């Protein structure tokens, strides 16, 4: 998985 | 180039861009209509933030695509094409914390306008950090932390700690920490210090906030995930 | 543009730019490459045209999409953005199709290749027929029909039935028969006829080209299903 | 469905 921005 | 184009048409306009996923046309647009002057609203804040989120999104991907191959290479085409698609990347970026700073952070007087910039602003320099390279970098990497700490300040003084920009704020700065400032401590204690926070205070929130609030709170714990 | 860039950096640079997804990219690479008057190999011509489908691709759906919001509406915005959309649409229409009349096709000796850059010129005079209104539209329809009708006629004398250029043409000519031409039935006689027709032939090919050929014989099934 | 082209 690649980590989550928003 | 939009200057001829009404306010209100360059908005709607922004709106169909949207729905025909013409990101470019909807960030153009929405560049118009910052520079028509006037404050943005909320709705208008959230339209200029996922047009260039989209734009810049696109182009980080390809440079993530050409950097790795670079890097497995390491003719000079492989670091041409990548220094291009950098230089597009870095244009989009100064053209966002161009708007930023003229005018839209010195007229933001509201925690929500104010906390969206900032965000915004420590988003692209953190986007600028992502290619920079030695300690010119180093000036990067302090404007996104600079941007990203004022916001963070002005949204523990003025916002629950569920608010989603608030929350938002805390997941990107948190990615800044672990992937840029080479601080992964930070990054896992500033997203646990998140969750917890807002967890305490979703009691508070009718069926759409707590909605709004546990969507970026289930982004927190997919990185805490990944993380840890 | 791309004129101070060697040939063979412009191909190199085009299989980039599919790998990073960048198909604007791709294609001005590859209109660099044909504007250096070389005939393009098979793989090249594979490349020129999936950069081109790609872009097109894109500005169709977006069209469709503002023509459906123009369409439930009947301000002047949305008839204006979707004429933007269409404008530029057609621009990328008349490079391609300029591309194979300065020089590809004239140069094509080979049937491959030949019919392969007539396959693209009816694929783009359908694209504009999408468009088109009135009679206008007449002529652009029956260069569709036309180019589409001398590719067929060379790919039956010329090549087997199961070449996946002569399974793909037939399945563009008989959506264009389908929805361009109000010509359902015909639609639906050539993509049974070149279904079985193929079918016939694959007890001739290896495992490699076995695969290439159903591959596309499954969008004329699929498209059989849908019609009938 | 959405026809099929290629
Ligand atoms: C879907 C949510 C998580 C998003 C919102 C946004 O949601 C809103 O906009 C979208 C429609 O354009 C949502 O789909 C909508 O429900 C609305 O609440 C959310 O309120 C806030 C502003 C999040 C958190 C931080 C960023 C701003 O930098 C942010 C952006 C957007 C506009 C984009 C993602
Ligand atoms: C995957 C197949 C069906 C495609 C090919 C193409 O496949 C080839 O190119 C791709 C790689 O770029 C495939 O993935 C590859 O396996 C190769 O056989 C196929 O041979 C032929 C030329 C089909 C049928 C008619 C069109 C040309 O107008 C066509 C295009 C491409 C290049 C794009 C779709
Ligand atoms: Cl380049
Ligand atoms: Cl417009
Ligand atoms: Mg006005
Ligand atoms: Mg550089
Ligand atoms: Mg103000
Ligand atoms: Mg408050
Ligand atoms: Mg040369
Ligand atoms: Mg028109
Ligand atoms: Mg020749
Ligand atoms: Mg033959």
Known sequence: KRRKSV | ?228
Chains 1, 4 share one sequence.
């Open chain 2, 1 to 228: 180039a939009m200057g001829s184009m009404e306010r209100a048409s360059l908005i709607q306009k922004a709106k169909l861009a949207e729905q025909a996923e013409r990101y470019e046309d909807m960030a153009a647009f929405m560049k118009g209509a910052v520079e028509k002057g006037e404050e943005l609203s909320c709705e208008e804040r959230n339209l200029l933030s996922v047009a260039y989120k989209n734009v810049v999104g696109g182009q980080r991907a390809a440079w993530r695509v050409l950097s790795s191959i670079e890097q497995k290479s390491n003719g000079p085409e492989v670091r041409e094409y990548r220094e291009k698609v950098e230089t597009e990347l870095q244009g989009v970026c100064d053209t966002v914390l161009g708007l930023l700073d003229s005018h839209l952070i010195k007229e933001a007087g509201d925690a929500e306008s104010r906390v969206f910039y900032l965000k915004m602003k420590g988003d692209y320099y953190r986007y600028l950090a992502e290619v920079a390279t030695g300690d010119d970098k180093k000036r990067i990497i302090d404007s996104a932390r600079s941007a990203y700490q004022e916001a963070m300040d002005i949204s523990k003084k003025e916002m629950p700690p569920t608010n989603p920009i608030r929350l938002g704020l805390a997941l990107n700065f948190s990615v800044f920490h672990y992937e840029i400032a080479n601080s992964p401590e930070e990054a896992i204690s500033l997203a646990k210090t998140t969750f917890d926070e807002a967890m305490a205070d979703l009691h508070t929130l009718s069926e759409d906030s707590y909605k709004d609030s546990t969507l970026i709170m289930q982004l927190l714990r997919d990185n805490l995930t990944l993380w840890t």
